[PDB]
Swiss-Prot record:
Lipid-binding residues (covalent, Phosphatidylserine amidated glycine): 128
Compartments reported by the entry: Cytoplasmic vesicle, Autophagosome membrane; Endomembrane system; Cytoplasm, Cytoskeleton
Tissues in which the UniProt entry reports expression: Most abundant in placenta, lung and ovary.
Modification(s) after translation: The precursor molecule is cleaved by ATG4 (ATG4A, ATG4B, ATG4C or ATG4D) to expose the glycine at the C-terminus and form the cytosolic form, LC3-I. The processed form is then activated by APG7L/ATG7, transferred to ATG3 and conjugated to phosphatidylethanolamine (PE) phospholipid to form the membrane-bound form, LC3-II. During non-canonical autophagy, the processed form is conjugated to phosphatidylserine (PS) phospholipid. ATG4 proteins also mediate the delipidation of PE-conjugated forms. (Microbial infection) The Legionella effector RavZ is a deconjugating enzyme that hydrolyzes the amide bond between the C-terminal glycine residue and an adjacent aromatic residue in ATG8 proteins conjugated to phosphatidylethanolamine (PE), producing an ATG8 protein that is resistant to reconjugation by the host machinery due to the cleavage of the reactive C-terminal glycine. RavZ is also able to mediate delipidation of ATG8 proteins conjugated to phosphatidylserine (PS).
Residues recorded with modification Phosphoserine: 95, 98
Keyword Glycosyltransferase: no
GO CC annotation, single: cytosol
Descriptive protein name: Microtubule-associated protein 1 light chain 3 gamma
Length: 128
């Protein structure tokens, strides 16, 4: 018969996370209420990127007064690989590294359906 191949077949629980749409709304609901000044961002590694390995943390609860540029510094610090290389932090896989943009603005603009802000990092887009 025609059995379709399932997409994305990893381990049962590769990460002790497993957040469903509902659970995402719940945690974000708790976070928003418990920490009004903090915003939960989720930083994922660029699927085409091979230079920069997965970071120590995937989820960052940072102050809304925090800027893209200072967050960039945090990301580079949270790298499991030592590198002072230049890299771009893209928001919603689209927005560029607006150094003057705060997490506050970013959240209100790029809030996802689950309430989190998803960011993607890579050394160089398209590499070059």
């Amino acid at each position: 018969g025609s059995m379709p191949p399932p997409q994305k077949i990893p381990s049962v629980r590769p990460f002790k996370q497993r957040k469903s749409l509902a659970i995402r709304q719940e945690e974000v609901a708790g976070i928003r209420a418990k920490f009004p000044n903090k915003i939960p961002v989720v930083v994922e590694r660029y699927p085409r990127e091979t230079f920069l390995p997965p970071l120590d943390k995937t989820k960052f609860l940072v102050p809304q007064e925090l800027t893209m540029t200072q967050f960039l510094s945090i990301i580079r610090s949270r790298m499991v690989l030592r590198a002072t290389e230049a890299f771009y932090l893209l928001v919603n896989n689209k927005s560029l590294v607006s150094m003057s943009a705060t997490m506050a603005e970013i959240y209100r603009d790029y809030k996802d359906e689950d309430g989190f802000v998803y960011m993607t990092y890579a050394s160089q887009e398209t590499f070059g």
